[PDB]
Each structure stands twice: as C-alpha cells, then as structure tokens.
C-alpha cells in the first residue's frame, strides 16, 4: 500500500487529488500548515479529509525540519501548490519541499505542481504569463539535479475554467445569448474534468510505466475546438448563440495596459486557443493517461456541460 503525502491539500486541484488518493486505496497523508488555522473553509476541509481516512501531518514551509519530518512518512509526495496570478503564484515555494525531499532520501517519487501547459514547450511564451512555465521549469531543474524520481502530469485545460464557460474568461458560467469565438474557433483544445485529472494522478503516482516521465492527459473525446464546444452547448439547449470572431491581433491589443494577472491569463489563453499549444504535438499511448488507465470512464464535455442546464 503506497503512502502518499499531499502538499496543497485544500487547493482547487489539491483537494480533488486527496479524495482520489483515498478512493484509490493509498494511505493518504495531508500537510496541515499552521498558517491556515483561522481559515474556516480550510480547517473544515481537513476535518472532512480525516473522516475519509486521511492522516493529518502538521508542518510549515518556514520550518525545514517539519517538511523533512513530513516527507519521511511516505513513499510518494504530490504537490498541488498554487500557480495562477489570479489566485496566487507561489510555484517556487516548492523549492523548499524539494530540499526537504533531498535531505530525507526515502521518497520514491515526487509529483510537482504541474497539471497544465507543458512547461518545456513554452520557451517562447508571452510575458508575464511565461513566469508560470519558467518557475515550473526551475522546480523541474531542482528535482532532477537532486536525482528525485518524478512524474509530470500535464496537458489538459481544467473544465471549470475553460469548458463550463464556453471559454469566455469573464465568467465561469455558459453565456446567455452571445459568445466570443477566438480566431476561427477551429484550433483543437484539450479539456478534462478536474475529478478525472485527480483520478489519473492517483493511478499514475505508483505506476512503473510513468516513473521519470511526463504523463499527458489528452482524453480523445475531449479534444475539441472552441466552436465544437459551443456547438455542444447549442445542441443541449436547442438555441444557437450569436457568435463574434475575435482576431488574434484584437485579442492581444493593449495587453500592456491591463493588470498583471489579467495579462498572464490572456497570454496563457492565447497559447491554448490561438496557437493550439495543447494539440500542436503528438503523444504516444504509453504516455497518455486515458490509454494508460482505460478503466477511468472520463467525463465527456457534453456530460460536463449538462450540469449547467
């Protein structure tokens, strides 16, 4: 039975990872930091984790030995550290965790906070959005310099942020009458339900086939253009939306005058929806999660959109 520590256990994807590790059968440990003692929602999330069988490990990123003590308890460490300018962007805090893992010596595998665009492919990304990928690469460099075995989980847009809203970044809900189509809307994007991402993560973290590999989440039925996604919604509702196409030059106009977190998100969106960075390269079945774990009946985007009806 694999012992797993989740760092970032109350995060958006982190809490789903915790639940998936428990459902998968791992002996699941969660890092409870003292710094969140007055955040009721985080405190009660940890209580709900206990009720499911998780074990609470106290530790703080400002207490190096507490980190060393925590990772000594487990076989596998999964980090779900924050990495969005709109929420918080603390990817480099994981360097402290890498050091602790190096000192401890017992960790068979480390999964850093990846779960998105594939950082080594983003060398030409727009600033400031490119900071996300630069920092994740710095964490990759530290892992590999330390000889820590790893799995990098990448490649799919979170469904809540990109599918549930028909990729309109101004809201998280489907639009009522009008929709913006980015470019011709014929660039393929990868969408995945975050619960499937979590389940794939829990299955891969002790899979010999993905040791020291990048694992892509590219479920075939969820590789869709934005227009195909919109058309699903039109069919489910029986109502055509009024579409306005946004050319690339207009999408990026006056970016320098927007707030940093919005510039970052605009830049990421551009790489995904105008440059097709999630589909602009092939990946083999031995490095794709839905082929690797075919017992995961992943949620397709029509069933995902059905929850908004």
Ligand X SMILES: NC(=O)C1=CN([C@@H]2O[C@H](COP(=O)(O)OP(=O)(O)OC[C@H]3O[C@@H](n4cnc5c(N)ncnc54)[C@H](OP(=O)(O)O)[C@@H]3O)[C@@H](O)[C@H]2O)C=CC1
Site track 62-91 with ligand GO6 (rule: CB under 6 A), x = hit: ---------------------xxxxx----
Please, which of residues 113-132 interact with ligand GO6 by CB under 6 A? 116-117, 132
Which pair of tokens denotes residue 159?
């469904």
Q: Name the H helices within 148-288.
A: 159-162, 194-204, 226-237, 248-251, 260-273
Question: Is there a binding annotation on residue 170?
Answer: yes
Question: Is there a binding annotation on residue 33?
Answer: yes
Question: Is there a binding annotation on residue 180?
Answer: no
Residue 161 interacts with a second copy (CB under 8 A): yes or no: yes
CB 157 within 8 A of CB 273: no
Breaks (C-N over 2.5 A) in the chain follow: none
Least CB distance to ligand GO6 at residue 56 (A) = 19
3-state secondary structure of 78: strand
Site track 47-86 with a second copy (rule: CB under 8 A), x = hit: x--xx-----------------------------------
Least CB distance to ligand X at residue 69 (A) = 16
Query: Catalytic: which of 15, 136, 203, 299?
Result: 136
Which positions ≥6 away from 205 have C-beta within 8 Å?
Answer: 2, 4, 21, 26, 76, 78, 109, 111, 151
Is-catalytic flag, 213?
no
- Residue selected from 59, 116, 119, 129 as contacting ligand X according to rule CB under 6 A: 116
For ligand X, give the closer residue by CB, 156 or 229: 156
C-alpha distances out from residue 53 to 28, 117, 175, 221, Å: 8, 32, 40, 34
* Residues annotated as catalytic (active site), given as ranges: 136
């Amino acid at each position: 039975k694999t012992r797993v520590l989740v760092v970032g256990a109350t995060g958006y994807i982190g809490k789903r990872i915790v639940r998936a590790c428990l459902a998968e059968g791992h002996e699941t440990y969660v890092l409870q930091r003292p710094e969140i003692g007055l955040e009721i929602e985080k405190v009660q999330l940890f209580l709900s984790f206990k009720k499911l069988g998780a074990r609470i490990v106290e530790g703080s990123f400002s207490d190096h030995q507490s980190l060393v003590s925590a990772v000594k308890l487990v076989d596998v460490v999964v980090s779900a550290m924050s990495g969005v300018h709109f929420r918080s962007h603390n990817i480099l805090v994981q360097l402290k965790l890498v050091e602790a893992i190096k000192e401890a010596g017992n960790v068979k595998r480390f999964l850093p906070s990846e779960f998105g665009m594939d950082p080594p492919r983003m060398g030409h990304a727009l600033p400031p959005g490119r900071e996300t990928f630069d920092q994740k690469m710095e964490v990759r460099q530290a892992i590999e310099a330390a000889g820590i075995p790893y799995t990098y989980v990448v490649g799919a847009c979170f469904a809540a942020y990109f599918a549930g809203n028909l990729s309109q970044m101004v809201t998280l809900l489907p639009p009522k009458e009008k929709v913006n189509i980015y470019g011709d809307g014929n660039v393929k994007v990868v969408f995945a339900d975050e619960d499937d991402i979590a389940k794939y993560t829990a299955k891969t973290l002790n899979d010999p086939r993905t040791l020291n590999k990048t694992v892509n989440i590219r479920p075939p039925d969820n590789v869709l253009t934005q227009l195909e996604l919109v058309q699903i919604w039109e069919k489910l509702t029986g109502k055509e939306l009024e579409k306005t196409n946004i050319a690339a030059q207009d999408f990026l106009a006056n970016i320098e005058q927007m707030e940093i977190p919005h510039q970052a998100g605009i830049g990421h969106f551009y790489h995904i929806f105008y440059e097709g960075c999630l589909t602009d390269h092939e990946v083999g079945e031995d490095e794709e999660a839905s082929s690797l774990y075919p017992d995961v009946k992943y949620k397709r985007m029509d069933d995902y959109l059905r929850m908004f009806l």
